[PDB]
Nucleic acid binder design. Sequence first.
RNA 1: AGAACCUUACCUGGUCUUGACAUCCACGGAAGUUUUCAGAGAUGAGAAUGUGCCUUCGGGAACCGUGAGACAGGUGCUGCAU
RNA 2: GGCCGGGAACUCAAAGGAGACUGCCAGUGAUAAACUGGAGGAAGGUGGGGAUGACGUCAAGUCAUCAUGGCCCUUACGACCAGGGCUACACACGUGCUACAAUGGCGCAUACAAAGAGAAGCGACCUCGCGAGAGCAAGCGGACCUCAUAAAGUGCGUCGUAGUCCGGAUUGGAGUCUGCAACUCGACUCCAUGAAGUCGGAAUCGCUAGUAAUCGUGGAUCAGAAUGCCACGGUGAAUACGU
Lengths: 114, 82, 127, 206, 151, 101, 98
Amino acid sequence: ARIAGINIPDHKHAVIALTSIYGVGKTRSKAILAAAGIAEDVKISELSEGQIDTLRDEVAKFVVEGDLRREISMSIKRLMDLGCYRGLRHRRGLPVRGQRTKTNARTRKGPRKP
Amino acid sequence: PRSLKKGPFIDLHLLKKVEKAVESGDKKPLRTWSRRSTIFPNMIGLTIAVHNGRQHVPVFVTDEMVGHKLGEFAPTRTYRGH
Amino acid sequence: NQYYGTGRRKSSAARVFIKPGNGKIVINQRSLEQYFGRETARMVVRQPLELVDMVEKLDLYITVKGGGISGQAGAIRHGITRALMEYDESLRSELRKAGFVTRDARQVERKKVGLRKARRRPQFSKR
Amino acid sequence: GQKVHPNGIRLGIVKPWNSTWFANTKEFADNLDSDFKVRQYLTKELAKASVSRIVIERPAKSIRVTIHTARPGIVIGKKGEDVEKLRKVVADIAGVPAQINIAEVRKPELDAKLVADSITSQLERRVMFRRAMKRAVQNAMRLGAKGIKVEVSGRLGGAEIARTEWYREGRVPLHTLRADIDYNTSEAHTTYGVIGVKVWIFKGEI
Amino acid sequence: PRRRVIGQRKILPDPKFGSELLAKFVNILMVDGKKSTAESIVYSALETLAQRSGKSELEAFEVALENVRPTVEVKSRRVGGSTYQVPVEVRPVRRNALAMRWIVEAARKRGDKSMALRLANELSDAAENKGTAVKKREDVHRMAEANKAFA
Amino acid sequence: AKQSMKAREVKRVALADKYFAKRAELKAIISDVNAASDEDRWNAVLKLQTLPRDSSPSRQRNRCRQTGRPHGFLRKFGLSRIKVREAAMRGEIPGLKKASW
Amino acid sequence: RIRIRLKAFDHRLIDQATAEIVETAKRTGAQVRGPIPLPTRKERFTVLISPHVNKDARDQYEIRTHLRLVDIVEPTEKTVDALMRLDLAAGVDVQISL
RNA sequence: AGAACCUUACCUGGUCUUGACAUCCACGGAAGUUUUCAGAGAUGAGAAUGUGCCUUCGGGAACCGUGAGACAGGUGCUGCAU
RNA sequence: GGCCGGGAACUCAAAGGAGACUGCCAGUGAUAAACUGGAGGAAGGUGGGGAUGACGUCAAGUCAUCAUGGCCCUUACGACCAGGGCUACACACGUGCUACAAUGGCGCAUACAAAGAGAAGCGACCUCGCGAGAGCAAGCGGACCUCAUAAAGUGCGUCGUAGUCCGGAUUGGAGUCUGCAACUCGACUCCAUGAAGUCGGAAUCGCUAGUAAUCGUGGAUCAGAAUGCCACGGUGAAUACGU
Ligand SMILES: [Mg+2]
Ligand SMILES: [Mg+2]
Ligand SMILES: [Mg+2]
Ligand SMILES: [Mg+2]
Ligand SMILES: [Mg+2]
Ligand SMILES: [Mg+2]
Ligand SMILES: [Mg+2]
Ligand SMILES: [Mg+2]
Ligand SMILES: [Mg+2]
Ligand SMILES: [Mg+2]
Ligand SMILES: [Mg+2]
Ligand SMILES: [Mg+2]
Ligand SMILES: [Mg+2]
Ligand SMILES: [Mg+2]
Ligand SMILES: [Mg+2]
Ligand SMILES: [Mg+2]
Ligand SMILES: [Mg+2]
Ligand SMILES: [Mg+2]
Ligand SMILES: [Mg+2]
Ligand SMILES: [Mg+2]
């Protein structure tokens, strides 16, 4: 219940609880469970510490919370320092992937200023 | 992006220009209009002036600007605020 | 001998043969139950015999195609009625009074230019 | 600007088509542009021969043109020289062997294309539009037509404000589909601009 | 309308109980044309209700309908000048319609676990005169008889 | 509609069907799993971009055959909607009549 | 054996051509199976009728390709020549296979 | 009824001018095909063929390129001239 | 296995016909028009839907489809090219799509459509890839082959009311395909991320039945590129006292 430096919840199925790891989604979660040999429909509380630390060293094969967070931070900082178009978009807080900016882009833009 | 089985993309005029530059000096800004050409590793240290629509923006190529296209460093639109 | 009735409803068409038998109902090589999971569709299919004589008296071999579940159920009821009218024609009035003989010809309206789905108009605005 | 084309709305019912051929989607646009070139050329040539229709047929890699004209002698010329000239200069642009037949319009006064053409020619020669319209209306009604409507639009008489003038006589039932209504238009290019003439001629139902 | 006397819809009876009233209830509860889903919900709810009540599914349903069904309803109208609330008697078909609609709305509120359980709980509360459909009918009957002066 | 642009379309069509079957084989090379993946398939990428741009059929526009209109085109007829309607009402288009159902 | 597929834009014209073909046969020899209707293609088009704007003003046109199949079996080889060398009705496309 | 280029009509820059698109003259001549260099391309320079049912050897249709002028061209304005 | 022989019954196809006319019955009505019911009939009274838009109005829209009077430019307001732009973003509005969930999400299994399109086009099958796709490659100018698994539905589990196994914006990385070319500025896939959003103020819109609602499908345009448009079917309501 303390995998990858975080505290994934019990009383949840294993597929659902593993997704609480930053860097593990549904696909990676079920892959971790299939490598560990654990049924997806079992609760983390219903596991034995051998099952949990096999889960741990199986998640170890993936870049996760701190590692992945700093990886993404370096990607974005690389773009911003390079000064490419995407870097300038990240700087100015505008859409990066060519989306509409005339009317939408509230997610990338924040709420309306005036 | 450009598929892997087709290789990267560069215009031949820019290719020949950067060959001649990497063979014979790193002095002049290579004036190019090919914003669509991928930046190759043999272009590092060059000072390629890429057309942005009305000027040629000088781009000093680094090894970090490799997987990219020349246009990403010549912003075409001007915006200072509202 | 073998009394036929076509039946059609809402893009669906049935072919219903009936014989004097002991309660067989087969639709596209499947029983009524393993073909119509819908209780309402099975009720519809059985209505025209529930109305007159269904205990065992007839064996129904039905081939239906086109349309959806309810369309096929209605086409089947129509075909059963049309076949029962070819076997003791005197049941025609008893059927007519409950319906089952009207074709039920209400089709899907065509989509119309400027409209969304043939009546839905697109969100008029004053200004 | 709210009425259906009479010919177009009656194309299935009473009026026939002007091009009679089957093509697949491959050569459909090619046949269509070739018919356009053919009709354009024939109209520009026989502009002085009172041509009313150019029916087009494509029987098996041939081009059969049928010129409904009021001056068959003028379109044929003598010796057939004119029709052979036209057959050659039609086969050239159609890319296939040509065959030009001629159908004489017995009553050019009962032909919406010929009536409109006469009216526009008068308007170019600066005849007064009311005179032209009334003349055409009376001509058709006396040559025998259950109705005729003539309509001219534009800077009539060189006026600075354009207006529409129309004269009806008899019956012109436009909403009746079985009605045999020959409708056609033309445009006069006067020194003041375009004046549009459109003529409806009713010739009974069924 | 303005011109026509409206001929009325022919509704098939309920396939499980032959009750056109229950079919109308299924229709009131149906969304998006999902009649299978609607009838599944109402059948589960009537099973649960018949269990909690002992009596028949239809009988408990009718008891709830009686307890939520209105007799008089106010109508914003006028003979002239100002539109006040005029209490008008409710004809029986509109009585059934309003009862079923208020029950379905009350059951769509008061989230319990699912629609079947919510509908069963609302029908039980109605049969014992304590749901919010009953309170809907009560406040309707109080709006009327507060506007009893008008008629 | 800009005789110059109609001429551009003519030029592009002629150039495309001229340089066809050469652009085609260069693209076949570039798409081939074989051809050394480093020399032939790389020089083809350069030959293709040295070919005239107007030889690429993706640069033709499908204007109306009569008015040269770039929008509202119909491939079955080769005309924009306006000329299609005119010819269809005049009866020029065989078998084409007003549809109702 | 021989399949003659006729397609026209007018059903009256295609029926005249079909009668023409099936009575070009039955004179040179027997054994023609008869015309099969074949679903008509209804190709619809929906164009804007205004020169500018007015989006919702449209004309809907359609071409109806009518299709017949004659299916002449076991030719007399006095019939193959009679069926070819014909391009009648000038508006009916004929495809003769086998 | 579908702006990456094209579309495209706009901008910057590089260019051309009887012209990208027609007809008319005279001059030299096949049309095409391959290819080199420079150029962002437009384009400007350079290299073998090729000799058609009209050759009555005169000339000729086709397709060029070049000169000069009629002109061509304009998605320039006016929908309040049509 | 309609797979074959075979049958031409049935569905269906598409040509030609019949059928609906207040034709019949009763009542009301001025002895009229008509109205109200009823019979039969598949259908009932303009059966449903469409096309069809009178004289005119707005000097409405369109000189940028086209044509056109006039005016204007004609070494330029004409023409060619490359790159950029039309995709800009403090904001405001219109029309939509997707959501806020349990009448649901997810997983497994399994039913029922219609209407279309297809030749530098649609492209099975098989193989490879998690996938988008790729390779090879039949068939098909088509009731034959392909697009092309309809989905909602149904059955069985799970989730158990949480901003959640809801939501899927955004962003990072890895790709595929089209195309000379995917930076500005494509679509799609995979992995990761898990935003606002708890049903929406004053207001306001559509709809009277197979309509609304909801579910999927196709087509034009089109190299690629729709939540738009045009079309198709599935399920399928509520309500109309009345003015
Ligand atoms: Mg996670
Ligand atoms: Mg709209
Ligand atoms: Mg629908
Ligand atoms: Mg294009
Ligand atoms: Mg043009
Ligand atoms: Mg087809
Ligand atoms: Mg310039
Ligand atoms: Mg105006
Ligand atoms: Mg006007
Ligand atoms: Mg105005
Ligand atoms: Mg204006
Ligand atoms: Mg200019
Ligand atoms: Mg350009
Ligand atoms: Mg651009
Ligand atoms: Mg725009
Ligand atoms: Mg989710
Ligand atoms: Mg979450
Ligand atoms: Mg929040
Ligand atoms: Mg209405
Ligand atoms: Mg109701």
